[PDB]
Structures are given as structure tokens and as C-alpha cells.
Amino acid sequence: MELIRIAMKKDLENDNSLMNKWATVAGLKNPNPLYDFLNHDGKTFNEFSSIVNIVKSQYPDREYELMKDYCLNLDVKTKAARSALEYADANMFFEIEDVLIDSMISCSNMKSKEYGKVYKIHRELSNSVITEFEAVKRLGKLNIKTPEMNSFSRLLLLYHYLSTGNFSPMAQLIKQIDLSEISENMYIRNTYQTRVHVLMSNIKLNENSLEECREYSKKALESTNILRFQVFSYLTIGNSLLFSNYELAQENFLKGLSISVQNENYNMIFQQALCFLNNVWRKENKWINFESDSIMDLQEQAHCFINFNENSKAKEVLDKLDLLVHNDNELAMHYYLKGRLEQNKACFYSSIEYFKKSNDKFLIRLPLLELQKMGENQKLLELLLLLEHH
Amino acid sequence: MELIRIAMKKDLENDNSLMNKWATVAGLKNPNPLYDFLNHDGKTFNEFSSIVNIVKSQYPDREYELMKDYCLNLDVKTKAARSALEYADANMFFEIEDVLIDSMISCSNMKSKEYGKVYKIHRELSNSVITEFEAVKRLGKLNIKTPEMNSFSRLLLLYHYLSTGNFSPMAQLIKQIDLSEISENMYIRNTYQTRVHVLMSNIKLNENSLEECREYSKKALESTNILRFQVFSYLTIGNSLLFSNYELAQENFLKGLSISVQNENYNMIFQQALCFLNNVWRKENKWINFESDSIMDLQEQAHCFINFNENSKAKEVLDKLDLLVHNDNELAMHYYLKGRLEQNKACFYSSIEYFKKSNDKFLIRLPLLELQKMGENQKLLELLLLLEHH
């Protein structure tokens, strides 16, 4: 048996009311599939949310342990296995996910093989094994048939656009996704819906449409019980308040921290959001990572040094940054930091240029402010706001 | 007998070598179609340019008179009649065109009927009898069959975009014209190629792609004997040199003037282009119309006064302009004039705003130059150069 089933039987001996509890949690509408699940090997529910909700309601502290065991004992040709692939990916359980992909690609079920091949494209692109052009080419050559994978083929590009600061294509591409065409696997329809909520929220953020940003993140939170999606929802809500409400921004970062501090990756992501928050507000900053050579962390070192008039220490950090490769959104911030250090309007104009190229209407408020303080003409600033890059 | 045949026979006695002279002017190998043309009623040359060329060679002072008599006597089911329709429309011989249109729409030849109907839409659209939307809708319901009218359906729309200064959709639209599909009527193939050359030239002008602009206009000039297209080729060539070559720009405007001596509207056009030329180069301007309340004429008054430090007269003229309603491009020039009169950078940014609104990448060089002269940052200027309105 599976660890989850061993543990479900043991606690069934000591408590029988669990059967009605487990059946209502899994939405079964009568407990026959449960009994079916436990008594015979290989029996799967028809919707994956039946185990996940049960593993959440009753063994929440060992979700990973139990699902890593169950998922990797699942026949990779089944619908539950195809579901476990999305479960693993959405939770960023790459140990579960990368094993399923290998088994599904070499397997004899074509639907599983399609899921596997496109999730593999997502994994290689998000680890910079292939370029965006190669990912697109490979997806075309796949001749994708399921509505699930036609949806995810667009999700993986949207995640790549986000991470590479290339925001202009995202809105048109996200609008091509039609989740209603997914009708056989509700778990995948339901998690993909949460994905689209988080992504729309981020698209709104970068459009400087902050109220609508917060609505989509609120919809995302209400629509999910997956920790990864709660994390990025509180992060995006917090970030929408960066320039307006310091304490409410901090409160969302600390709320996201309260459910995720144990995880090293999530711990770092809220540390960085808090670090940028305190730099924008020019406060003392206990969140800087002085032991890092990532662009984000070095930029925050320089931003803080600049806020406190430590110009040579700032220049020293920016000398390091000059020798690192930047994407367009990172380079925009780089020139903004330079413009503040040198009090040089041309560097602020180069920052705007790259914020326009990345199509970031949110962070561009930083160089615009500095040009305002230096007495820039108001019609000129209005002009720069209404012109785009294309 | 039509007048042209009467006159041709009459002159054939005096100079019997005219038969051979006309044979080569009409592009015939042997003179039997010419012999056919004079002696037998109702028969046509295979290509309409044969008789157009003869009329221009030997009776150029009577072109309208002779061609109106000849065209309005054609059987409208014939290729000569469909050719005559385009000949009338290209020359703006509206009295011939309108009669051809009505007779064609009612005849039993579905090809002539289709020609009549889409030229009809072109005339109604170009006189604002109908909106663009109604014109697209009407062309849609025609389900256009011939390659000629598929081409012309696009040309009439480009003329509308041109008439309204809406340059943005023009490059996309003109790229869809494929004149190589026009194989049966070479007269229409050739005149449409002139139409496309001239439209391409004006397109390139507005893009500030000036060497290509002049190439397409020289291609237009070499391809045609139609006054309208010669006039606008010389105008566009001269305009393309406004910022580079005073003497060659003047030479092209004066050549245009020479061929439109007895066309009041064309004459005024070259007068206005020379007036603008002399204000761009800040020379004495003997082309100014001081008895005019059109925007363009008044702008040139103010431009000349500003050039010659006559700022009170200049303010008087701009006072007059303030009480007149300006469109987008006109407003761009207005702010340029105000910015130079008041020496104020802000009115130059408004000038740029409206040049960007009209997708005029040529005339925008005027405020950009003044901004540079007032010490505007070089990276700002590039930014204003690169960014687009949408």
C-alpha cells in the first residue's frame, strides 16, 4: 500500500466517524469511493481534489511526505497521474514533477505523453536550458490536442515573460486562454483558474492598475488552498501598496511570511519584498542581503546606500552590477539607481526607456518622481507617460 | 463617327505618314488595328492606352473634349469602357466617370457592373456621402470577384486614410495589393501601379524615409502621363527635400508649377509648398498669401514674421489663429509657432504630442530641432524620437 493508505487505515481503527468526515471533505457525496480507495490497490478517485483535500484536512503537516509517496506510485497512464503532474508543478514539488515527466514521456499513453512533453518544455525554459524561441518551436512541433495542454502551453510562456521582465505580450496572450474548454479534469481546471488569477493580478500590477490588481489576488486567495498561490497572492497585494501604504504593504508581506517562513525559498521572497519596500520609503532597512551576488540583492544594497548618502559604497556596488547581464526590467532599475547616484537626468531617461521596453507602468513611477524633483517640465513628463515603445 | 476618328481621318490626308507615327505611339506592331479603328465603327483597341497616347500626342489641347466624346460613346459592357472608367477617375473627369458608373451598374455585364459599383463607393466615400464604415460594409456585400476591383477596393480606402491624415493603417493595407494578379487589362495594371507608386511615396514621406520616398516618386513619374500623378510626384519629391536641399526642392516645386499653370487648385498647392519651403529656410518669402483665412496660409504669415523678428505682427496672426478650429497636424504646427514666438519649451512638447498623434515623423523634426537649440538633453531627444503614440 501507499503511506497515505496505511496511515488512513490506522486512524480508521481508532476513529470511525472519520469516514463521514473524509467523504464530505473529498466531496464524494457518499462514501463508496473512499472504501473503494482504501481496500483495492491502484484505485483512483475521479477528481484529484478528493485525496488532496483529505490529506489537507487530516494530515496537513505531512502533505509533502504523503503525496510524494502516493504520486510516485501512481500509474503514469491515468488521469490521476496527469493530475499529480499539475499538483506537483503548482506546488513547485520538482521532485515529484520531474519524475512524473520522465515516466510520462517514455510511456505508452499518448495523453500522458503530451502532458509530459509540454511540462518538460516549461521546466527547461524556466531553467534557461532552452530559449523562448526553441520552446515555441518545440510546442508547435508537438501538435497539442488536449485543451489542458493548449492552456498550459500559454501559461508557461506567460511565466517566462513575467520572469524575464518582458511584459508587453502578456495581456494579449493571457486573453487567449479559455479554461471552460477544460471539462474532463476539474482539478486541472480549478488550479489553472488560480494560476490565471495570480497572473492577471501581476499583469494589472505592471499596468499600474492597482485596485484591479488587488481584486484578482483576492479572487486567487479565495479560489485556492495551495500554499504557493497564497504566497504569490500576498506578495502581489503587498507590492501593489509599495508606493501608497507602507504598513498595509508590510502587513501583507508579514501575512505571507506567517504561512511560509519555514520554506527557504518563500522566506527569501518576502525578505526581498520587505527590503525593496523599506528602500522605496527610504527607511532603515534590516532586510538587505549583504552576502549575495544576485542583481536584485545588489540593487537593494546600492538603493539603501544611496538613501543614506553613502555614495562611494553605492558606487562600489554599482561597479559590480555593471559587470552582470541585465534583462530590460533590471536595466531600467539599474539606470534609475545611477541617476540618483550621479544626479544625472540622462540616466533617468535611460531608465524610462527600458521601463517602456519592458512595458512596466508601475516601477517607472520611480524615475518619473526623480525627474519631477529636478524640475522637469510637466508637459514633458505627461508626454513620456502617454508614449509607448512598440 | 466619334470626334477623334473624324479628326484623325481629316489629318490622315495631310500627312499620310501619321498612320505609322500613330502606330508606334499606340504601341502597335502593325497598323491594322489603327486601320480597323478608323474605318469600322464600335471596334476598340485591345488596350486603352493606344488611344490615350494618340490623343495626347496629336490633340493634347483637346484631350478632355475628345476623350469625353469617345468614352461616353463606348459600349459599357466592353473592356474599353471599364478602361475608360479608370481613365476618368484617375484624371478626376467626374462628368465622364459618373455617367460611366450609372450605365455600368445597370448593364448585364457583371464585370462592368462590379467596376461601376466599387468606383461608385469610392466617389461617395471621397465626398463624405457615406462614412468609412458604410463603405467597408458596402464593399463587403459586393463579394468582389475581379483582381482589378480587389485592388481598387483597397486603393479607395487608402485615399480615405490619406484624405484624413490617418497614416497608421496605410502601410498594412497597401502591402496587400498584388497587381501581378491583373493580367487581362494592362491599362488598369499600369495606372494602378502609378497609383501605388504615388501612395507609397507619400507613405515613406510621413515615415521620414526620404530616399525611398524619392525613389517611389521617380518610379511614379517614369510610369505615367497622367497630370494628377505627375503633380503629386513633384510635390512629394520637393517636400522630401524641405530639410536638406533648398534649390532642388524649389526646382521640383517650380516644375510642378509649370505643368499645372491652368489648374487653379494645383497652382495654389505649389505656391503653398514654396511658401513653406522659404519659411523653413528663413529666407525672404514672396509666396505668402496675406489675403487668406485658411490655417495653412495664416501659419506661414506667422512663421515668416517670427523668422524676421516681427513678433507683434506674429502675435497678431496667432491671435487670429486662436479663433479658428484646428485639427491634429494643424495644432502641431500652431504649438511650434507659439513655442518659437514665446521661446517656451512647453509649447514644443505640445507640438510633439500632436505630431505623434498624427504619426508625422517628418515635420516633427521642427520642434525637435528647437528643443535641441534650447539645450534639451540628448537622451531625452532620442527618447522623444523613438517613442510612439498608438
Author numbering:
A (entry chain A), B (entry chain B): 1 to 390
Published text:
Recently, in Bacillus phages, a peptide communication system named the arbitrium system was identified that plays an essential role in lysis–lysogeny decisions during infection of Bacillus host cells. AimR is composed of two domains, a N-terminal domain that is responsible for DNA binding and a C-terminal domain that specifically recognizes the arbitrium peptide. The overall structure of AimR is similar to that of RRNPP family proteins.
In our previous reported structures of apo- and peptide-bound AimR, we were unable to trace the N-terminal DBD structure due to the poor electronic densities. Finally, we traced the density of the DBD for AimR with or without the peptide. Here, we updated the apo- and peptide-bound form structures containing the DBD, although there were only subtle differences between them. The last C-terminal capping helices from two AimR molecules undergo dimerization via a network of van der Waals interactions. The distance between the two aspartic acid residues in the inner cavity, D15 of AimRA and D15 of AimRB, is approximately 125 Å in apo- or peptide-bound AimR. In the absence of the arbitrium peptide, dimeric AimR exhibits the dynamic open and closed conformations equally, which favor peptide and DNA binding, respectively.
